[PDB]
Design a protein around this ligand. Structure first.
Ligand code: FAD
Ligand code: FAD
Ligand code: 3II
Ligand code: 3II
Lengths: 464, 463
């Protein structure tokens, strides 16, 4: 039985990064993955996803603003090509992971890991073999799986993001359950490629986790794009009759049946917690069936850590990575910085215009008891926005009055996902609106919209 | 007719300074005879970025139609691009007037000439002539095009003004000056099928940037089809009606260049003559730019100078910032000096963009710092690949003492938007170690910055 200082389960964004950090800190490392090196993100998530969003974005432009941009000529778009490009990008990143594992002398174990003890891991190698490994520390980065609508099930026409993302051919129509980022993005792409799209969301607003002002704007954008979004509507059942699928939904005691060629299941993702002997390791779960964890990613078992979607704190790639680093550094006894309140971490939805936020929404900060101060700046008043051809959206900043400290940021606009860094940095290192308003922003850029809010937070904006 | 503050010029610096002044309860009056919003909003910034956007789409299609599964025969009409640039421009200019009324700032439509240290003589556009006194004055007269020594303007030898206000495009053009402005025109024109040749006296293009950036940008422009001649000196320009002949010197040998039009954009001199700066007693510097202290305060106590006229960093956001400092200093409000202007951000908007701040690698080494460099290529960035352009890189320069930043230099798809975090950190003493802990959303270009931070602190992770 080979023995490693550290052993990681799962090669996703969190796993492969936690191994890299471990290796750097001089820790004998081995990573166990049976299928996805780079996990969901690099294989059938983040990576292929954002490549497709880019193709859809172009179709959107060369279709609605072609004339406004002085572009003429009848052009067509082949989704097949978009599909092929997303797979190549995926292949590239995946090949890059192995390079990193190699560069860092990280041992690769190709199979499925199952805890047989708090320090022993039995593996079912992909080539039929079997090998057990011991370890002083273990990092569980097993990820999550798509949660299905209760009672429903997968089939030829009822699928998860996986079967859909790996589909080179597009259906005529589709019904998406869940108005979260994942659901909205597939909607943006598909709709732009000519697919009939209807998105159902139990909650009252699309992207319910975002600030209220953001949900409204985005819903207005999608309705215009031609996508039908039904909020406060419950998906009762899903029936795949082959030639088509029938989904029944209810709202205010009144039911109606929706029908389409396919239906995508995307209401949530449950942490992968069963099937690999967590019980034999003694790792406890939370009431939401997620691996319980502390500020240093430690489970109820001192030497066993849990990172990534599997802990369900913030199911995003950058978070997984970050937690991976924290787990690694803590094991090696090196200097680290707990992520702290995960609500403060940044997040983005990549439909166009983007959605980027961090921290608390206006209403949450209100309920939390802060002396809420708000500054909203519309992009219709931003030079760069008008120059790019998309002056919609806005920048909404939430802060506390006492010292002008940032509580949260909520943005909707062209590629606004790249404007968050400044906000989170200031929030983390006690920089207030006063210090923020003194940062000169290049002209003309979307980032100037952040400068204005800083001013409208400290007092009154200048160009407004 | 007296005011607490009087602003000369209504460009980015003047009109923003007037707003701030007004906000501080100061009676304010601004004098402008032609361009409300100045160069920037009328014939600079605003229309320029609009045209650059159009040219980008032409590029995106031409260069990558196939790669994106976009097939078909499309054609682009510059005239329409032109039309939109004017509309976007007129929109902003109208915005200037709106803010002037909203802040009860008085508009004076004429040219201002100093008579005293507190008196301005105004030649009204209507033909009349009036006088105005003030306790404080802000000079935001901008700059003008500096012509190549011994040459002059003519039918086919123009400045950025004529060129940018031209709805029709030439078949060929020669550009004098490989600065951002010239490079941007080269980008636009080339994408629209114009033969483009850019002549630069200095050995590199974008000579003010970091050498690695100059090298990288020159490569992409050559791939675009733009001919750039560096270490080449423009000797003379002969407008012959049909074709313009530009005599140049490269490698101690004289050769001729020919095109229909020639754009003069090697530099811009601060507007300092013709309006009585001497009557007011304001002193100019060796380079003939109004001298100012860290508060935009000239040798004349109650007289300030902001924008291009002081030549510190000729950019609109710089112009706006100094105006705020001036207005606050005048009212005696809470203010913060801009500090070392070299530490201010700047971006060139060709595609890919160029974005930087602080010192170049060579400058930091020359300054005597304990240079530490971390460079990350976008070929390793998921977002860059998704975008369809993994070219470019992020190059950060820091001092090894505590890991304080000295400069940032990048080239990549819309990198101009990525500077905020860097200038903020350098401004409030946040070192590499602090910056290395800021989480960046995935997948974004900003992640490249994140890797560089780790590189400075020790080892990157995804490279
Ligand atoms: C369509 C889609 C788009 C997305 N877009 C984004 C985006 O733009 N940005 C973002 O930040 N996030 C995005 N996400 C979410 C992101 O993919 C996840 O947050 C991230 O993959 C979680 O990383 P992880 O390492 O925790 O787990 P995963 O990437 O899920 O990897 C876990 C790995 O563990 C392996 N494993 C499981 N059990 C075992 C075992 N017992 N033994 C060995 N190996 C095991 C699995 O095979 C799997 O490959 C997206 C998700 C989807 C579905
Ligand atoms: C083609 C081009 C593109 C550019 N693009 C950018 C860009 O993308 N980003 C950027 O940051 N910068 C850009 N610039 C530079 C930017 O335009 C200048 O830095 C900025 O305009 C300077 O502002 P200012 O207020 O100092 O002066 P200006 O905007 O030049 O305004 C000076 C004003 O003063 C008036 N004036 C002069 N003398 C008198 C007098 N005696 N009495 C009354 N009024 C007077 C003038 O009529 C004029 O309107 C660009 C420049 C050009 C030429
Ligand atoms: C483009 O990349 C993507 C892909 C997915 C999402 C998304 O919709 N998420 C992930 C983040 C989310 C909500 C769901 C989360 O998992 N968190 C916890 C959470 O919401 N709770 C889930 C935990 C849970 C609940 C019940 C049960 Cl039974 C189990 C579990 Cl584990 C916080 N959070 C979020 C918060 C604010 C704004 C935006 C997002 C996303 O959103 C921007 C971007
Ligand atoms: C897309 O927006 C634009 C439009 C113009 C420029 C540009 O070419 N500039 C302005 C900044 C500049 C160099 C010239 C400057 O004015 N500086 C001072 C300066 O050089 N002083 C010149 C003033 C002057 C000129 C002529 C005369 Cl006769 C006197 C004086 Cl005082 C430094 N500097 C700079 C540019 C890039 C990286 C680092 C620094 C630009 O550049 C990014 C972007």
């Amino acid at each position: 039985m080979t023995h490693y200082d550290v052993v990681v389960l799962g090669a996703g964004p969190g796993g492969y990064v936690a191994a890299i950090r471990a290796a750097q800190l001089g820790l004998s490392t081995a990573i166990v993955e049976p299928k996805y090196w780079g996990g969901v993100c690099l294989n059938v998530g983040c990576i292929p996803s954002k490549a497709l969003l880019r193709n859809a974005e172009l179709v959107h432009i060369f279709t609605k603003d072609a004339k406004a941009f002085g572009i003429s000529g009848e052009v067509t778009f082949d989704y097949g090509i978009a599909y092929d490009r997303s797979r190549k990008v995926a292949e590239g990143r995946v090949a890059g992971v192995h390079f990193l594992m190699k560069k860092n002398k990280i041992t690769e174990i190709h199979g499925y890991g199952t805890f047989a003890d708090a320090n022993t891991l039995l593996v079912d190698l992909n080539d039929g073999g079997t090998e057990s490994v011991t370890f002083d520390n273990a990092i569980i980065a097993t990820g999550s799986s798509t949660r299905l609508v209760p009672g429903t099930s997968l089939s030829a026409n009822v699928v998860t993001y996986e079967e859909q993302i790996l589909s080179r051919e597009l259906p005529k129509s589709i019904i998406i359950a869940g108005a979260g980022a994942i659901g909205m993005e597939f909607g943006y792409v598909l709709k732009n490629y000519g697919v009939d799209v209807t998105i159902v969301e139990f909650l009252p607003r699309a992207l319910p986790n975002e600030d209220a002002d953001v949900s409204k704007e985005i819903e207005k954008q999608f309705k215009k794009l031609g996508v039908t979004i039904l909020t406060a509507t419950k998906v009762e059942s899903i029936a795949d009759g082959g030639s088509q699928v029938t989904v029944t939904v209810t709202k205010d005691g009144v039911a109606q049946e929706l029908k389409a060629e396919k239906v995508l299941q995307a209401i949530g993702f449950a942490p992968n917690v069963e099937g690999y002997g967590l019980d034999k390791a003694g790792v406890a779960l939370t009431d939401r069936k997620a691996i319980g964890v502390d500020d240093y990613m430690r489970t109820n078992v001192g030497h066993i850590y849990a990172i990534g979607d599997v802990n369900g704190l913030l199911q995003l790639a950058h978070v997984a990575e970050a937690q991976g680093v924290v787990a690694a550094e803590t094991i090696a006894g090196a200097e680290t910085l707990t992520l702290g309140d995960h609500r403060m971490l940044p997040r983005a939805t990549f439909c166009q215009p983007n959605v980027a936020s961090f921290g608390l929404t206006e209403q949450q900060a209100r309920n939390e008891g802060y002396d809420v101060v708000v500054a909203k700046f519309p992009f219709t008043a931003n030079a760069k926005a008008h120059g790019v051809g998309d002056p919609s959206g806005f920048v909404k900043l939430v802060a506390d009055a006492k010292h002008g400290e940032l509580l949260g940021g909520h943005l909707v606009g062209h590629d606004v996902a790249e404007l968050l860094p400044e906000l989170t940095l200031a929030q983390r290192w006690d920089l207030t609106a006063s210090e923020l308003a003194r940062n000169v922003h290049t002209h003309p850029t979307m980032s100037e919209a952040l400068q204005e809010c800083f001013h409208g937070l400290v007092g009154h904006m200048i160009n407004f």
